[PDB]
């Protein structure tokens, strides 16, 4: 992962957010490859104040160096991360609960009919299955009304409380009694971030089983990302050495090396050459040949990299 100078603030912001949410355990900072400090929340980021202090320590360390970066200088961030230790804030947990509460009245199973299975009373009429009211999410689950946790350890939504129903699953007209409907205890879990999001396709869902009974899910999680859960990665902020090619200094990229790097517009370069020559020998001024701070200069926009 490498980024140019103009976008350093949003790169550092990403690293600060990872320190705050416990996904980043340590950052090693280096200027031009020379180690310049390490940023590590004390006590494995147990307290919010220590994680915020780490994010501030990182910004103070780098913001001036990145703001005046040039000359080909660069800044490296060697970042050890763990996506699974992610914690979420009170506001983030509140937003997930708000969405989760919209599933409270949704229907899991419709009333049965003569030709489509569904909700059937446990008491029969004529020894025959009669339909019952639809089975709603709230009939099987009690979604929590509040979030739990702390600023230090993060916030979470408790697992929705499981319930039972005596209503059954069958068809109207059937002398055979309806089948049982039961929560799936392996498909109901709490949400605390931890690199997961709520899987809304699989959550709050009835699944007809091979033996004719029905299982229901509560909250089911999935990964928020495809990227690997753990690792150590190095984010680099670069500056362009060819931004200011000073022909009189001890370090400048040569014309040949510049031409290996970039393809140039032949008209743009030919016209710059002619203006330099005409100014040097004939005294003709040109806007292509700046004289500023004791140095003659010209400006080029490459057509692109050479590939």
């Amino acid at each position: 992962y490498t980024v140019v100078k103009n976008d350093w603030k949003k790169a550092v912001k990403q690293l600060q957010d990872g320190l705050k949410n416990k996904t980043i355990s340590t950052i090693k900072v280096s200027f031009n490859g020379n180690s310049v400090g390490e940023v590590t929340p004390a006590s494995s980021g147990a307290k919010k104040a220590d994680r915020d202090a780490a994010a501030e320590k990182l910004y103070n360390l780098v913001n001036t160096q990145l703001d005046k970066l040039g000359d080909g200088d660069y800044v490296d961030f060697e970042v050890t991360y763990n996506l699974a230790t992610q914690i979420i804030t009170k506001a983030e947990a509140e937003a997930v609960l708000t969405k989760l509460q919209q599933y409270n009245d949704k229907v899991l199973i419709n009333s049965a009919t003569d030709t489509v299975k569904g909700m059937v009373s446990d008491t029969q009429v004529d020894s025959k299955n009669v339909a019952a009211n639809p089975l709603k999410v709230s009939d099987m689950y009690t979604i929590p009304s509040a979030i739990t946790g702390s600023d230090d350890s993060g916030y979470s939504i408790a697992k929705p409380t499981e319930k039972t129903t005596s209503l059954l699953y069958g068809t109207v007209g059937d002398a055979t009694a309806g089948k049982a409907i039961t929560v799936d205890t392996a498909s109901n879990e709490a949400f605390a971030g931890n690199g997961k999001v709520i899987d809304y396709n699989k959550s709050f869902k009835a699944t007809v089983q091979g033996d004719g009974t029905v299982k229901t899910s509560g909250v089911v999680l999935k990964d928020a990302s495809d990227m690997a859960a753990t690792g150590t990665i190095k984010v680099r902020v670069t500056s362009a050495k060819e931004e200011s090619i000073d022909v009189d200094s001890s370090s400048y990229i040569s014309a040949e090396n510049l031409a290996k790097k970039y393809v140039f517009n032949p008209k743009e370069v030919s016209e710059a050459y002619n203006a330099i020559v005409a100014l040097q020998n004939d005294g003709i001024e040109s806007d292509l040949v700046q004289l500023v701070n004791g140095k003659y200069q010209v400006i080029f926009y490459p057509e692109g990299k050479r590939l």
Binding site: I245, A259, I276, Y296, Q297
Partner: peptide, 27 residues
Amino acid sequence: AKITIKANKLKDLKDYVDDLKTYNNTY
């Protein structure tokens, strides 16, 4: 992004740009 070549002397700027034009043209 822009590239800025500069020199105290017009002759050194000319030599650099001349070289740049030559190498740009060999491709």
